[PDB]
Structure 1
Amino acid sequence: GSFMKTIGIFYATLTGTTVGIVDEIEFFLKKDDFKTFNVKNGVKEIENFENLILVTPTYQVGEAHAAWMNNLKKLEEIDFTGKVVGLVGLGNQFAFGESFCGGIRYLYDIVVKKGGKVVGFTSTDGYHYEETSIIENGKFIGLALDEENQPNLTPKRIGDWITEIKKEFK
C-alpha cells in the first residue's frame, strides 16, 4: 500500500520496565500505524498483523514472562506464513550470564516453525555473556536490552533496530 501495513506490538511486563521500552518503540513509530497489546489479555490478535514486534522481559532462568509462556500453545496455533517479526528482550546480562534475554528464544522458535520470518538480528558487541541460547548465525536473534546496566544505550539500540526492521516490513 501507500504506507506500511499496521505493526502489531505485543508485550508483557512484571515490574513495568518493558512498558517504558514499548513507549520508546511507539515513539520511533510515531508516523507509522501500530496497535499495542499486553499479552496478559491473550495473544489471539497476533493473527491479525503481518508486521509484528514481540517484546518480553526474562524470568525463571531464561523464560519469557509468564503471560507469554502460558500462551505458547495458542501462539503455535497461528500460521506465521508471510509474517515479519522482530523480537525484543529485556534482561540483566551480568546477573544472568547464561540466560540473558533468553525469553525471546521461545518466541523465535515458534515463529520460525510456523512459517514466519524473524528480522532484526543484532551484534553481540558490547555485551557480556558466559553462555547464550539466543544466538543464530553469530548474532542475537533480536534486540537485547539491559535497563539495569546499560540504560543509556537503549534509545539508540531501539532507534537503530526499528530503522532496520522497517526495511523488511510489508
Structure 2
Amino acid sequence: AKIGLFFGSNTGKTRKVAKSIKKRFDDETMSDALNVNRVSAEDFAQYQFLILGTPTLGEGELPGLSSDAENESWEEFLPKIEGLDFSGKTVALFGLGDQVGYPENYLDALGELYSFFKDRGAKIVGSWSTDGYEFESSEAVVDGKFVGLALDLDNQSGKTDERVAAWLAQIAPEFGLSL
C-alpha cells in the first residue's frame, strides 16, 4: 500500500478506530490497520505516508509495559525506529483518551508521539480544534489546538464517526487522496 496505518492499543478502542479509518480506502491506497506489536522497523520505514493512532495510559504515558498494557506497544516500538529519519515524510496522528477521568492528561500520549516524529523532521498534518472537549491540560495541545485528531470513546462515542470523517477530509490533500 501507499499509506501505512499503525496503532497501539490495550483494550481495543484505538484498533477499532484504526480499522474504521482503513474501512474507506483501497488495498493500494492504504495498508491494513497494523499493531506496532508486530511491525519491523524495516517494514515501518518503507512508508512515506503514515497515519498513527494511540491511547494514553497510566500516568499520561504511551501504552506499553511501563503503563501496564497487557502486551508491548508504542513504548517499546519507538526505540526500534528512533534511529530512523522522517524528513520528507508525512504523518497524521490520532489519539484516544478519557477527558473526564483524566482532565489534566487528556491525550498526553498523542503529545509524546507528536514529538517523536516531529523531532525527526516529519511533516505533520491533522491538527484538531479543542472545541467540544472538556479537559484542563493536554500535552497534545500546541498553540491552543490538538496536534492530531482528538477522540474519546469513553465519554463521547457519539461523535467519533463525525470526528473521524472530518479529520480524514481534512488530511486528504496531504495524503494524495482524491477525497
SS in 1 for 2:56: strand
1:147 corresponds to 2:144: no
- Give 1:63's aligned amino acid: E
Contact 1:147 1:154 survives alignment (8 Å): yes
Provide the residue aligned with 2:36 in structure 1: 39
Q: Give the aligned length.
A: 166
The amino acid across from 1:81 in the alignment is S
Decide whether the 8 Å contact of 1:51 with 1:84 is kept in 2: yes
Aligned residues with identical type, % of pairs:
36
Q: Answer whether contact 2:92 2:126 (CA < 8 A) is retained.
A: yes
Partner of 2:167 in structure 1?
A: 161
In structure 2, the partner of 1:54 is 52
Residues 82 and 116 in structure 1, CA contact (< 8 A), matched pair in contact too: yes
Q: Which runs of 5+ in 2 are unaligned?
A: 65-72
- Deviation (angstroms), 1:119: 0.4
Tell me how far apart the structure 1 counterparts of residues 108 and 39 of structure 2 sit (CA, whole Å). 21
Q: How does 1:5-154 map to 2 (within 5 A)?
A: 6-30=2-26, 33-35=29-31, 36-42=33-39, 44=41, 45-66=43-64, 67-154=73-160
- Per-residue Cα deviation, 1:42-66 (whole angstroms, up to 9, x for no partner): 3512211111011111101211211
When normalised by structure 2's length, the TM-score is 0.87
Q: Within 1, Cα distance between the matches of 2:147 and 2:126?
A: 7
User: What TM-score results when the alignment is normalised by the length of structure 1?
Assistant: 0.91
1:55-89 deviation per Cα after TM superposition (whole angstroms, max 9, x unaligned): 11110121121110112222321110111111110
Q: Which residue identity is paired with 1:41?
A: R
Q: Cα deviations across residues 122-144 of structure 1 (Å, max 9, x unaligned)? A: 00001011112111122100011
List gaps (5 residues or longer) in structure 1.
none
Report the CA distance between 1:17 and its aligned residue.
1.3
- Would the aligned equivalents of 1:56 and 1:103 in 2 still touch at CA under 8 Å? yes
Q: Which amino acid in 2 is paired with 1:169?
A: F
Q: Which has a greater percent of strand?
A: 1
The AA in structure 1 aligned to 2:99 is: Q
Cα contact 1:58–1:65 (8 A) shared by 2: yes
Name the stretch that deviates more: 106-115 or 42-51. Answer: 42-51
Higher RCO (CA < 8 A, seq sep 6+): 1
The RMSD of aligned alpha carbons is 1.6
How many Å separate the matches in 2 of 1:30 and 1:99? 35
